[model samples]
Target: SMSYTWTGALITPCAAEESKLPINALSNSLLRHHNMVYATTSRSAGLRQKKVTFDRLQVLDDHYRDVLKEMKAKASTVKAKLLSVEEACKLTPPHSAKSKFGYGAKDVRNLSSKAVNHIHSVWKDLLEDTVTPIDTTIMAKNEVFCVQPERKPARLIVFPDLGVRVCEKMALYDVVSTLPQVVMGSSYGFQYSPGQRVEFLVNTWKSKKNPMGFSYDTRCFDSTVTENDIRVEESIYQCCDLAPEARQAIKSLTERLYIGGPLTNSKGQNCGYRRCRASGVLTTSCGNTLTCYLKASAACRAAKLQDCTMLVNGDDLVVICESAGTQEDAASLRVFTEAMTRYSAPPGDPPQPEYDLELITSCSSNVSVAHDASGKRVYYLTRDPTTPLARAAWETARHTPVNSWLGNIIMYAPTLWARMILMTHFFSILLAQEQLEKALDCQIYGACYSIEPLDLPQIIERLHGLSAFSLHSYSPGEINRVASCLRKLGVPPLRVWRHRARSVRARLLSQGGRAATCGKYLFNWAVKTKLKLTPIPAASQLDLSGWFVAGYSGGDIYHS
Candidate 1:
């Protein structure tokens, strides 16, 4: 992603390598315009159309072929209702068609990993101006965490997202409690925490510094799997101790169950590559089985299916294990839950429905802030784009009540924004792809919370530097005590704002609170922490820079 242009000159013709695209690079207007085009195309392509909604499918019995056929035809009629859908889907046969959405945008905007590091180096030189941090004290309701090495990395190298990495994973225990509170308090702003478990892929692992640099498995994409043998074994989580809060969270849960289903295409092949088109690859049926591909291949191995659900009674811990075509596989969630009733629970108090934790994966998928016709905005389940994050801003804009599918489910753009800020706007595919996982959990347990804190920890670790997101897992009444301890160590900490003390004057009468109050605080924090950051008050004002350009140019880029 460099910006260049082809200029028609009277003198001489230029070579293709030297020619630039006929788009502006710095202003980013070109990318914005292009994004509009893709959005329009995706809409035109009928990729945005709802082929088969969960609602419609819920009424059908997959076992009955007639019912399935009727459902498809009925769904097609509904699709015809939308002009956009009619234009995209109706024109083409429902055979092997491609979705107007794909991974190109993410790749282009993020740059290759090599390019990301280069951009980071360049940006580092321009990071003198820092944004102030608006340290918040968010009050969380029913928060829990636990440390278990069952599926965790054994040798924990602090995975710093924003700041610095430390020697030991346990060193940042103070962050667990304090950071979560800070994030919740800051109007659920950015939650920065210490990340100890970093992602270390097997292919990247290097044994004994080789002078010849030769490897038995030499393919850049090839990796050797070491069998899990007590005599000779190695894997992620092969050596680390569980964090204290992780331990507590684990203990509080009654059962851990592995919940997931198999995702495949019509050809009966894994939807691994962009093989079959999304249109042809309809979600045929929910599955309940262990994935042999994952077990056979030792990429990033998750907990075993049986161990994940080895809960006796509902009291035993149950961990659900599942994966999706993309990182944000939300719809294919029932497999995990449905698979639950099969194996009887172990002897103990029956597992409470409440203890069921639907832990979906993560990625970056920001919500569209654009306003549609009728001066209204909409979301998947609602026409009124008025979410919780919008409640405070909606009055100033045009919004109506929505009794649609979303009803009043709170909408938050936590992980997407945090990742952009922390990742320096790289790998939006992974980020955008994560939204589905978040939505998947919302549909299942509904009690799921997004762990989107792009604080110092993620930042440093991302750069392959030394930093980590810190945490504090103190008990109740220990806030003041810990503040005292920090004070003793010259780290001034105080609880200035009351959690439930918003003034009626400010809420009902005052026309005073500006976005700058928080923006300024964030700016200061960046400066205090010496981090390169920018704060956009709303998505409408977002300077996408290099992120959305390729998405606009590329034919397939999903906004969802």
Candidate 2:
């Protein structure tokens, strides 16, 4: 898209005409498309409609906007109340009090201090490269297998069905305001009940690369050492089955090195975010547990600026690189801190003990926010590869202005989550996991808890705080009735069990069953229709009453 200063004048017909056609067309048919020059400044009837469009969009936007506003207002009040009741909670900084149970509370002061020290340590050596301009010229030529910033954004035009004027200056607000739906086959059932529309995300750093007068492909990630690490682990099984002959051949040819078990490498995999150095290995093969550290070490070094060659010690190379495996074990922050302390030493000086919460979350979590910029805005946009790359090379590329094909393609084929240093709150682990998988273009069968049996007191305890649902105890055939309805919808495995005495019913009351919705159905209607069994009967059925009384937080009750 061409650069605009937004002179705040009426969009002229001539300006619109000049930019209406392709850049080449405008140049060749200079006489034909001269309107663009004037159109940029003109206030066309459509341009005037932006105000109206935003007003119309208001209805759809209110729900998100108000909830966030209300929550912030409530949190402030709650903190005030807490402070009034307790004096110790008001410690200035470096609150030194220990918990009665031996669990010390970490208020904002200690946390911030620790974080700053850690940042200082990490920034000491890497300051030079931190501010340097990264050269990604090789990627456009596709000359280097990987460019300096192995992942960066490239734009494409989106051709949505609405045919509305796709703005060149797409904002985070715009991305959220417009949710695009993607259609899939009937396997997962529930086709277009409400429709599947993905809420796209965009946030990028300032750049002045091309004539579009500097542009930003907001969603591309800079690097993902941790994600990439997981990717290597997922694909580990591929190397596991490598032929013995192949393994021996590689062992004889390549060098080896050893690394720590629960192997946390100081120099993570190759990516644009951070530069890593390789430490060569000593040996290749050794019994059931081949010397992967040695082989991984060599592979890491040999790669240099290139992608990590994830050949394990006994690798029979396979082409898969999925992040589906587990690491050491689940430990608390204390454990992780202690673990880091053992290897805390940096080469030059004492490195600070900084922890990234992103590393703490489980593989399943989704990050969604509205008005994040106006709220807890914490992060910067870097290059991302989770989203697909366009065919156009970067250097030779020039920006396309209005109604441009290339521009449309890039917008439509969006890249993955762009912003780094994401806000810790407003994130659901399971949801984030789902979104990440979607970004990677992977289909995952997520495991969820099926409601187990419980007594009246337990059920009452669960239902204490929720407002959208009510609970009920239904018998065998009664559940069959609701299962029948889902069966008609082609939902799968209509199953339910009585906890102890009888099956409990969860009646939903909310207009949309919004969050508080789960458990057995209300009536049976299965005998008539055929269920192809996709989204699964158990998950699709809704009974909000059970959730309202479930006392658990909204996030846990619904998200869990």
Candidate 3:
């Protein structure tokens, strides 16, 4: 029912005139910091001019062969089956990306009128005609950064005739769920929650001899995907035992559709073509995981970094190895880069030592300090405030296609902005509308979940640990940025947030049942003297051991 328009300064739900916000105290503060905001280059743009080319050719060692062999054995055991058109259609979310086929998401979801027939036709075409590259719609994703100026880059999204996407899921989702983690073991990036993730870092750090780790940036990771890389990924799939038709379908899809696709712009013009990995495809996460682990494992061996530890999420690489002093560490990083280049994964930036855990940034999150209720230092994961702030504004204006605020609040619950700003504003608005029980969309471990006010405390404790309840101190840098954003965006200040949170807490408590529990546990931080900490009852029931996709196991799982 709504369309989004992105201006350089803001992403609002509807089109509006480019007039400046009313000049007020907040506006004045925002204006003072206006010049500080400007688009910085995204990681994708950081690449050598010469491309720092790498050879696609790889000679498999005993380790690589053994890993592949086990992964295939696991894949063989998976029950490969296709979902019916209706079943696949049912999985389509109401707010899914719209098809370029002149139909809206609601039309696709309801299977209204000709929608079902159209979807079925698309699926049949995918199965029968195995040579056409799918056309994808491209849009500038207006990604807001709180600490820096906002930046939007064209994201190629395949709104593949809804049925085709569902079909793709049927073909590959199982492999995504089971195979990657089996192959990559502990190195699987997606497996851990934020708290578990922190625990892993601390455990590994303590275990290391000298404990030096640095993150590697890959320039245009998706764009660098070559056809040869796609074929290499497909060959790994071939190692698995598949139903004859499933095998053929997977093969045909890779060669014709997955290897490359056509790119179309908002103007309905043929913008260009994409020969690299399409970021929107079902195989994107799995494919990237396999390819990255392959390159990094090979590179680690060639570099001879003793007792090296690694964790990867797609192109984001973090390696912790025994420190060889500053001089030797630099030289070894050079060797690591060289090895990766030989394996067709050239580094975008030179690697260096990160002496402290808080300094290590992974998955766009870094640890920052905040004081708990006891006045002791506590740390939690956070990124630029821009995305969360922009999302808050979007939700305030109209229903966003994605409730990014919910996901961010859940993930970064212990962060100051999330606790004080996000929770206060969202709950106040929801309470005013009497929609506290509303099931809102959220995602974790590549699965969709409906979140309500009641789930916040449990989700927070799970993601942030005990720090969620006790953390109260806000870092000055983050506080200043949040203040500026509130004023710049015409949102209220911290004082107003405190007032709203009190009302939300009261309303939640009055609702009784889980809502009351949520108020007691989640909003205690807003009060002067917090309530006694209560443990979430079923928190122990949640298991994510199988969800993570890549990490190093001792002496390598393959050899073990």
Candidate 4:
């Protein structure tokens, strides 16, 4: 079965698209080469369609059945409740698409009678008619930078209208948010923040007698999902103690939308049909995680990898296991790939074993070591800084709803590149605008966060600990990558960033209060004569709940 069928209609765009990064005075201050940065648009959707379309074949074995039975047993013990219409509406992102029936995101949040009425009607209709395929709007996602793949079609996300999305939350919000951790337990990836994730990977790698690990990237993992896989996921959800209406709605949603649907373009024209996971549905995050783990866990047994432990976040998977030897490890990984291919998740680039823990990248991050102010070793996660830096340049010129640079600074605070380049550049801009108190939007693990610049000192301390403020002595590998990325993108080297940070540090220090705290903590590494760092009094008082509890990737969720 193929994931999609095209009627040769264009995946239309709703607005004007720009492929090149427009250089502005603000962005010119950050990077010199405008040629390096580009954004994705709907124009390349045809190329994306060609790559994503493929026939999938799955063969389930006793190993797969065993994993499923165990997963269900764990799922049956957990209890999930249905959310009221009000509760679900509150969970919707304020930027979520408006309903075709005259209601929008703000209307849904305010619980307007018109929006609530439409939601109720949609729910009733779903419960009544379980066979008709729901319509999904398909559009190309406009994301910034990856360089060579600048025309990589930017990928597509398919989702229903705002009203039906609210109804989805009413029925299954609790189930999707709470079910993943209970069933997967320690293996669940979203339960961790960046610092916690590094600790887990480090400890897991050290636990093995002779550790060997590799990251498994499924070729279009979403498209590989079969109709049977969707039904199987629904059955797993049903095992929990759910409201009768919740159970029925889950079945209805599965049959009508989750399994397959008619595709509609931005102009309401019929594009084609989909028999795969809707990338923007509530179940997309949890369903993909469960399916990826199940397939890989079963494949582990099929390949006989010793004492295999998997860490999965959506479709990103990394397995750390005891290695027999070099030759044996290679043979087992080959067998693992074979099992994965038979399960309809063939790899675009085949998996290979890595003896070094730091070399195995998963979730687009890898564990690396640095030193704090007191010279104690600290482990943290980092990726190539190219994409984050490119996007930051794009964002600096044109204001967007999401400030990805701020998000990158928070998540990768301890990275050599992020600490020097990201922090220095953004703080300079904020200082000049006198907008340090203004909250900007940034997303972490797919949930939107409104963060103020003055609060970075306390927030960074809380998220990554005080070590994030004074981290130095980055690994040679990390420094090399950062330097090379800067060169490749024609961005100023670390020397220039260091020079800029010195002035930014002095400017903030002169302001005193929270601004002084940011100067002291964030720019300490740039100063030759550094002030002694201590725990910020405000850091411990911050309410960080729901920050790292569960992933809400495509669940239309928000945290108050």
TM-score of each: 0.19, 0.17, 0.78, 0.98
- What candidate 2 gets wrong by more than 4 Å, as runs, is 1-239, 253-335, 341-366, 369-560
Question: Per-residue alpha-carbon lDDT of model 2 for 1-560, expressed as tens digits?
Answer: 11111222322221222212223321321112122221121223233223111100001123223333432333222211111101212221122222222222243224344333332332232222223221110001011011222221221111110100001001011111111001011111111111011111111001111101000011111110122222222222123233343233222212110111111111221112111101111111111011122222222232121221121112211011111112211122123223212211001121121122111111111112121212432221112221111111111122321112122121221111111001010012213233212211111111112222111112212222111011123223334533443233222232212111012122211212321121211111111232221122233233423221111110111112
* Winning model by TM-score: 4
- Please write out the lDDT profile of model 1 over residues 1-560, one tens digit for every residue: 10111121111111111111122332131012211110011111121111211110011122223322332332222210111211212212112112122322233233334423433432232232122211111011111111212311111010111100110112211222122222112111112111110111111112112101100111110001111110011111111234443333222210110011122222333321111111101100000001111111111112122212111100112222233323222222223222222111111222221111211111111112212223342211111111221221221121222211121222221121121121221112223333212221111011112222222222222321211111112222323433433333222122211111122112211222232232222122222233333332332332222221110100111221
**lDDT tens string, model 3, 1-560?**
00111122211112222221123333332123333333222222123112322324434455445545555565555554555555555656666666656675567557675667777676566667778777665443333333434233323243344455656665665565566766676777777776666667777878987888888776656656677778878877766656666666677678766787665555566645556666666677778878777777767777778787787777777888899888888888888887776555666666777877767777777766788767887766676665566545545545644577787887788877787777877777777778878878755544455666666776677667766877765777667766766666555567767776777888889998777877777778667777888677866665433323332210001100
Sort by TM-score, best first: what order?
A: 4, 3, 1, 2
Q: Evaluate model 3: give its lDDT.
A: 0.62
Structure candidate 3, residue pairs in collision: 145-386, 146-386, 186-551, 187-550, 187-551, 188-549, 188-550, 188-551, 189-550, 191-548
lDDT of 4: 0.89
- Model 1 scores a C-alpha lDDT of 0.19
What RMSD does each model have against the real structure?
A: 26.9, 29.8, 7.8, 1.2
State which candidate has the highest lDDT.
4
- Candidate 1 vs candidate 3: the TM-score winner is 3
Quickly count the clashes in candidate 2: 75
Instruction: Give the poorly placed runs of model 4, Cα more than 4 Å off.
Output: 149-151
